[PDB]
Amino acid sequence: AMADALLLTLDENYIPQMKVLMTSIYINNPGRIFDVYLIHSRISEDKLKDLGEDLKKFSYTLYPIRATDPKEMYYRLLAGEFLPENLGEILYLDPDMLVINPLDDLLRTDISDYILAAASHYYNSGLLLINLKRAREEIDPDEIFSFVEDNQDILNAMYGDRIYPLDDLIYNYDARNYSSYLIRSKKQADLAWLMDHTVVLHFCGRDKPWKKNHRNKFTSLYKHYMSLTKRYLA
Amino acid sequence: ADALLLTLDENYIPQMKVLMTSIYINNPGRIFDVYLIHSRISEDKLKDLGEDLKKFSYTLYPIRATKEMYYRLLAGEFLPENLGEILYLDPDMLVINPLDDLLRTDISDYILAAASHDYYNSGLLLINLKRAREEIDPDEIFSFVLPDQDILNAMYGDRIYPLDDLIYNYDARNYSSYLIRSKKQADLAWLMDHTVVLHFCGRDKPWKKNHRNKFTSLYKHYMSLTKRYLA
C-alpha cells in the first residue's frame, strides 16, 4: 500500500463535483497518491476514460466498478462486496464536499477494532473510513435488505455500536451551519480556526455552492476551487 | 524568468509569504525572481525567507535601501540595469488566477501599466524599467512632495497603460459596488473565473481576527496553506 484508497458512489451528474473534490484533495495533500474506486450504475465508458485521464494528472488512478441491476445508499454499505478482497481500508466521500486540510490524521486513525469511523451531526454517512476486513465479515447483504424492506438510518440502527466516532466540526462540517458550530464551540470555531483545523466541508441539502444563488461564508472558497479545477484539469 | 518586486519591512513578511503561496498555486510550473527592497530586515530573516521561497523554486533578491512609497516609484534606481521589466505587488494582495496575460502585456510605449478607478492605484504596477529609467527623475519626485498614488497620478497619468481594476486590482472591500457597477455580472462565480488580483485595502485586513466579508474564508484558507506549504 503506497496509495490510500478513496471510494465514491455516484453517477455522471455528480462528476463535476467529484473533480472539484479531487482537486481540493490534491492541493491540500501535496505528494500523496490516491487510488479512487468509483461504484456507478450507468456512467459511459467514454466519460470514465475522460475522468481517468483527468485524475492521472494528479497521479491518482481511477478504478471504476459498474454495479448491476436509493441506488447509491446500497453501494456504500455493501462496499466490501464490490471492492477487491485484498484491500483493507477505504475512505468513502460524498461528492458535494471540499477537503481543505491534510487527510493524514484521519487516514492514521486506528479503526482496527471497528467496522468504520463516521462523524456524528446519530452518525452522518457522507464520510466513512471503512475497515473492509471487518465490513466483509460483519455486514451481510440480505441482512441489510431485510432491514430496508421493513423500515443513514441503516448505519445507525444496525451498526451504531461498531462505529468509531469522528468530530463533525473537523470531518463533516455542515457548511450551512456556521453559527451553530460557532455558538456550540463557545466562539472558538470562527473562520480562522476552521481554516486551520477543519478537514472536510460538506455542502449538505438543496443549497449547493455550484449554483447561482449560494451565499454564505464559504461560497468564495468553493467557487475558487471550481476555477482551480477547470485550470488544473484543463 | 519573470521578475516580481516587493517593498516592505519585517512586519509584512507573513503577508508576503501568503501572496507568494497564492501565486504558486495559481501559476503552476512558473518560476519567478523576487526582488525585495527593504530598509533593514535582518540577515537571518532574509535567509529564512529565501529558503522558504526556494520551496516554490522562486529566487529571493534582497536589496537594502541604505520610506516604501518612494521605493516603488524609484524602482529604476534600485534594481539592476540589465532588468527590463518587473511586476510590483503590495503584500496585502492575493493572486487567484494565472498571471500569464498580464505578464505578456506589451508596454513598450509606456512607463508602466496600472489599474484605474480616471484615478490609478499603485498597488499593482507592471513597470517598463527601460522607460522608467529614462523618464523618472528622483529630483523631480522629491521636490514635488494625500497617499503616494497622488505622485503616480500627478506626474505620469499620460504614460500609463490602463488595466481594469475588476481583474488586476480588485478592491476586496467593495464587492457590492463592483456588482452594481458591472450590472450584476461580477458575482462570485464570475470573479473566480476572471479576476486575477484581490487587494485587501484599508485598515480591515483579512489576517486580523475580526475580518468579515465574502472573501474572508478564501484568504484565511491561503494563510493555512502558506503555513503548510512552507513548514
Side-chain angles (χ1 to χ4, degrees), chain B residues 1-8 10-66 68 70-148 152-231:
Chain B
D2 303 295
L4 306 179
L5 173 64
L6 289 101
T7 53
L8 46 89
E10 223 158 65
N11 289 330
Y12 258 113
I13 286 173
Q15 289 67 49
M16 171 176 170
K17 291 175 170 173
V18 177
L19 173 55
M20 298 296 119
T21 308
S22 72
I23 293 173
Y24 176 72
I25 287 156
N26 292 283
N27 297 267
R30 266 216 190 256
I31 288 315
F32 294 94
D33 288 346
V34 178
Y35 295 82
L36 173 51
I37 303 176
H38 66 97
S39 288
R40 279 162 224 92
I41 298 165
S42 75
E43 265 177 332
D44 279 14
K45 272 176 170 199
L46 293 174
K47 250 175 136 162
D48 161 274
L49 173 63
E51 162 259 351
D52 284 353
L53 266 59
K54 281 291 185 201
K55 292 169 173 129
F56 300 153
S57 303
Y58 302 173
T59 303
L60 182 72
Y61 290 107
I63 300 162
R64 176 168 36 265
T66 42
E68 330 285 313
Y70 289 96
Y71 295 165
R72 84 183 69 174
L73 294 163
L74 305 186
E77 306 288 330
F78 289 106
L79 288 162
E81 312 264 279
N82 65 332
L83 193 52
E85 188 161 333
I86 196 159
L87 174 58
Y88 170 80
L89 301 171
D90 274 352
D92 61 353
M93 291 181 141
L94 198 71
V95 168
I96 63 166
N97 265 308
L99 294 165
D100 297 304
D101 296 339
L102 184 58
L103 294 165
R104 285 189 322 260
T105 304
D106 183 11
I107 58 164
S108 294
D109 298 316
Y110 305 85
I111 291 174
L112 59 84
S116 35
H117 218 146
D118 198 29
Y119 201 69
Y120 287 113
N121 185 258
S122 67
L124 178 144
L125 310 168
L126 183 72
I127 300 168
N128 181 334
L129 292 170
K130 306 194 170 57
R131 291 198 180 267
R133 280 189 276 263
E134 286 155 354
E135 303 176 41
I136 293 184
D137 304 13
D139 203 25
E140 284 200 45
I141 291 271
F142 293 141
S143 71
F144 193 99
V145 182
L146 24 62
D148 108 78
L152 179 62
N153 289 280
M155 286 186 133
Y156 317 114
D158 43 350
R159 310 286 309 105
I160 296 186
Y161 178 112
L163 302 170
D164 185 1
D165 75 320
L166 191 57
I167 309 302
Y168 292 113
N169 201 324
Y170 182 103
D171 175 358
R173 300 171 308 173
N174 272 135
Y175 175 86
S176 305
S177 296
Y178 284 110
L179 184 70
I180 293 163
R181 164 192 132 171
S182 69
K183 324 302 190 139
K184 302 197 155 146
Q185 178 176 253
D187 63 8
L188 284 176
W190 190 94
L191 297 171
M192 300 297 109
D193 287 335
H194 302 90
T195 299
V196 176
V197 192
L198 300 177
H199 189 187
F200 291 91
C201 306
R203 293 291 243 129
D204 182 19
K205 298 298 197 203
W207 50 97
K208 296 292 169 213
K209 176 57 152 189
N210 291 337
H211 190 274
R212 184 189 58 77
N213 69 29
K214 287 173 168 56
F215 304 108
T216 306
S217 57
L218 181 61
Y219 189 85
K220 308 276 194 202
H221 179 58
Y222 277 90
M223 287 173 73
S224 169
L225 281 166
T226 301
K227 287 160 167 102
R228 298 173 270 138
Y229 275 37
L230 300 180

Side-chain angles (χ1 to χ4, degrees), chain A residues 24-68 70-151 153-157:
Chain A
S24 69
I25 292 172
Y26 178 77
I27 294 306
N28 290 282
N29 293 271
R32 262 198 126 93
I33 296 306
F34 293 96
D35 285 347
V36 178
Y37 295 82
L38 172 57
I39 306 174
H40 68 98
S41 74
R42 305 157 304 188
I43 301 170
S44 66
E45 195 54 61
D46 82 78
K47 288 195 196 49
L48 287 167
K49 195 162 184 322
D50 168 86
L51 179 59
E53 169 267 336
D54 285 339
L55 294 200
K56 223 61 199 193
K57 297 173 175 146
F58 297 155
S59 306
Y60 300 178
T61 309
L62 187 68
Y63 289 98
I65 300 170
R66 201 154 93 122
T68 43
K71 276 281 183 84
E72 322 307 327
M73 195 178 287
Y74 288 114
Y75 299 171
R76 193 181 321 207
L77 293 173
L78 299 163
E81 311 291 314
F82 289 106
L83 295 163
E85 288 250 279
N86 54 249
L87 186 62
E89 193 166 325
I90 192 161
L91 177 59
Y92 170 80
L93 300 165
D94 277 350
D96 61 340
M97 286 176 153
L98 199 68
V99 171
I100 57 159
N101 268 305
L103 289 165
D104 199 62
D105 283 343
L106 178 56
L107 299 166
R108 293 185 306 95
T109 312
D110 178 356
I111 60 175
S112 56
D113 232 0
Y114 295 88
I115 290 168
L116 59 87
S120 13
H121 269 156
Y122 79 84
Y123 297 102
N124 190 254
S125 67
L127 171 153
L128 303 168
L129 184 69
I130 303 170
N131 178 335
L132 291 163
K133 304 199 208 174
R134 292 209 187 285
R136 285 181 290 258
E137 305 305 320
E138 290 183 60
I139 293 172
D140 297 14
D142 52 65
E143 205 152 300
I144 286 189
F145 301 110
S146 319
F147 176 96
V148 158
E149 282 188 48
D150 314 354
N151 207 340
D153 304 322
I154 288 158
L155 181 68
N156 287 283

